[PDB]
Symmetry: C2
């Protein structure tokens, strides 16, 4: 059972929700966690979804060593030292890019498209959101042209929007990072941003980089043009991590614990046979098994919780804290009437559905729930963004736990100034406010509109806020 209130002690509510739903287990190296089936199976769903979509695009998977010759060093084995100290892979570029130079010779070798599903390590932790060790996906492509490369960068970004909005039901905002927030080696970084109302922080959801040609020049990734001319390749890289799970929990969770969007739920309907005195139990258990079969033929994912060592009441709370969307109760009365009682997790509403009507009615409720979760979350995000024009509007907005959309000249130096300044003021009253992205969806920029900070001509509207 979850006792901490989401809107009162947020970090405590969160720890409760993930721990009490059996998603994680804690561990003696800080920033490292055991990922349990309840969390891992949800990751399987999005992984499957993304994997299928990238295969449609002709992307292939592969696996690279975790060892190369910033860095973390394996220097000893036992007590004997290593004749050469071997590095754990800091980043994949080190290995993939030499290999790309050797595999690419002609335009006939392009585009080259590889992805990896693996875990990675980094070196003040929060489960899912910021960990020393996570699962992710990372893709690296090589093209003959920038247009082709750029088209892939956006296609992936669109898949990341889908992963969040279609699967996780989390609304996200597409945009470019500032010069100071993009990948430093790369030409151009696109991103997806989410928002956590309860502490008003923005959080980067996934990223898709147009890397251009620097790494190609650096690793001599070169190809023969159709006319026989030596050209550099145009590269992209992209990734999305198990952070996405964090955001989903934080977005849809309520006081009773997890709420899982049907489209990614391991168990969509849990069936709970009510036993009170042992005269009707056989018929009841038998019916449930039939309903499971009937529902499964409609692609519904179902688990009968017929464990005899637990009460009906214990089962409700259990499947509620785990966030199963739909609970179906079948007791002696329900059996006699030919019906089942169904309760949605998002709202608590209960329905009495007759056996024949069950598949279509559950299919429909799940769509209702999935959509309802997203729209509620979308409404919240819009409610958390304040359009503003002057810097003095900023601190009052951040105290409302809101983000801000403001006209900015896009001067990198101004962004550092803005970071420092907002940090400084937040202390008097980290607290810093930084660019989250410059949205693809730009409102109009009336002529002569000034940057909200420097007074100079504003170039574009920028999403700002406190951040993870």
């Amino acid at each position: 059972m979850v006792t901490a209130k989401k809107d009162e002690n947020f970090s405590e509510w969160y720890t409760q929700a993930i721990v009490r739903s059996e998603m994680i287990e804690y561990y003696d190296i800080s920033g490292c966690y055991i990922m349990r089936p309840w969390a891992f199976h949800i990751w399987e769903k999005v992984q499957r979804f993304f994997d299928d979509e990238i295969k449609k695009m002709g992307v292939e998977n592969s696996y690279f060593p975790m060892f190369v010759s910033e860095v973390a060093w394996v220097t000893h084995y036992g007590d004997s030292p290593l004749p050469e100290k071997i590095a754990i892979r800091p980043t994949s570029e080190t290995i993939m890019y030499p290999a790309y130079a050797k595999w690419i010779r002609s335009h006939r070798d392009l585009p080259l498209k590889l992805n990896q599903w693996c875990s990675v390590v980094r070196w003040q932790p929060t489960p899912f959101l910021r960990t020393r060790e996570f699962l992710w996906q990372e893709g690296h492509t090589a093209h003959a042209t920038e247009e082709e490369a750029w088209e892939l960068v956006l296609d992936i970004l669109e898949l990341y929007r889908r992963w969040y909005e279609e699967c996780l039901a989390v609304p996200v905002i597409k945009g470019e990072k500032s010069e100071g927030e993009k990948f430093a080696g790369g030409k151009k970084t696109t991103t997806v941003e989410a928002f956590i109302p309860e502490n008003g922080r923005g959080i980067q959801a996934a990223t898709s980089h147009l890397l251009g040609t620097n790494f190609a020049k650096m690793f001599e990734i070169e190809f023969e043009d159709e006319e026989g001319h030596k050209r550099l390749v145009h590269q992209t890289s992209w990734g999305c991590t198990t952070r996405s799970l964090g955001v989903m929990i934080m977005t849809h969770g309520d006081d009773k614990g997890l709420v899982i969007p049907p489209r990614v739920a391991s168990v969509q309907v849990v069936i709970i046979p009510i036993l009170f005195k042992d005269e009707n139990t056989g018929e009841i258990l038998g019916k449930c098994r039939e309903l499971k079969t009937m529902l499964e033929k409609a692609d519904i994912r179902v688990r009968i919780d017929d464990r005899s060592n637990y009460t009906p009441g214990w089962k409700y709370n259990h499947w509620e804290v785990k966030g199963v969307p739909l609970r179906l109760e079948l007791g002696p009365k329900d059996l006699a009437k030919g019906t089942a009682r169904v309760v949605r997790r998002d709202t608590g509403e209960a329905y009495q559905i007759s056996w024949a009507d069950l598949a279509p009615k559950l299919l429909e409720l799940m769509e209702g729930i999935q959509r309802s979760l997203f729209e509620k979350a979308k409404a919240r995000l819009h409610e958390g963004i304040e359009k503003i024009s002057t810097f003095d509007e900023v601190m009052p907005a951040l105290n409302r736990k809101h983000l801000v959309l403001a006209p900015w000249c896009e001067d990198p130096e101004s962004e550092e100034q803005i970071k420092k300044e907002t940090q400084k003021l937040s202390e008097i009253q980290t607290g810093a406010m930084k660019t989250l992205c410059i949205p693809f969806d730009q409102p109009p920029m009336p002529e002569g509109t000034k940057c909200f900070y420097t007074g100079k001509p504003a170039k574009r509207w920028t999403l700002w806020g406190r951040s993870y």
Copy 2:
């Protein structure tokens, strides 16, 4: 092109085939390889098949951390770490303290976990991709049950999946069996196995294992639960794993002198379309029909690739896809455009078929089935031809020298195995003068009859069970 002959130069053969098929790239750290798609997608398909099957059993996936508090130590970050930390040696050290916390009552049982991941084994000797590597991919399962009976049952269920992984997906025949006391897992009580055979060097190779760990691990980590009557019991555990070795085994089993032969059930591309074009001839007539034929074939779920690359001849493409072991090649030339047919070539036998465009999808599904059945049947016939049923130790060296295994009546005494290993190691060296040790591979589940007085082929003590021996990987 592959230049080494599979039975004359087996190792060289194997090395050419994996590289020229573009299954792997080489890497500056020895025993470490990049696994390119042609290889990795075969891993993807077996993983899918296996992961579907264990979910039906209630096994659930999880992810345990790669680092911990014979070990490889990470000591610095840049130029510098306070506690020297370690790449996870086995998974038991992290997993079993967690099982100890998770298990308290009979209601918590059974507990069935699995992990898909990469592993580092630091000691490898001489490196060969899929066979002897620093890093590999695997799955490892770990369960815990109220009774030994239930766990044992799970062990055998898992072993059955391992037979299916090999025989159904990779068309590799295997033999289920019990390991001997000296070949089993040290700490466990019973260990079952799935063995394969490599005709070209006469070696057996362990394909996968499923262990009845019993309770000694429970005792060591204090994984106890309370009985349904309040008594503290130790859990009965299992574990089981299957690695990328499965692929090296598939490679060895079906390959021939032109290169790889990949079973249609796991081939990344099942049907390569090869437009009979030359440089700057393209008029769209050939590519056009090729694309239509592709679309038509994917409507029957055939995995299809057109090789439209402009700067290679058809002959070079024929060889390139043969080396890669694509099961089926479909050739579309001007002549075929004129006759309303395609010519398709079976990779496994060379046999060619003239097939009319409308017959292609049903005739190709049928061919792929046949290729899949044939690969298994021919490997199974080879497997049973490689096994000699014997009565005494004398018949041993001659059989080893025919690159075969032996099936012998054995008393199962653990010291005899160590002896049988030494003697054969010694006799092999004698011949080298003018490696070689023979061990138990398994005690097969499938027991032929055992007449009343039958003696142990080596000690003369009365024999207990028939036992499969051979030289080994």
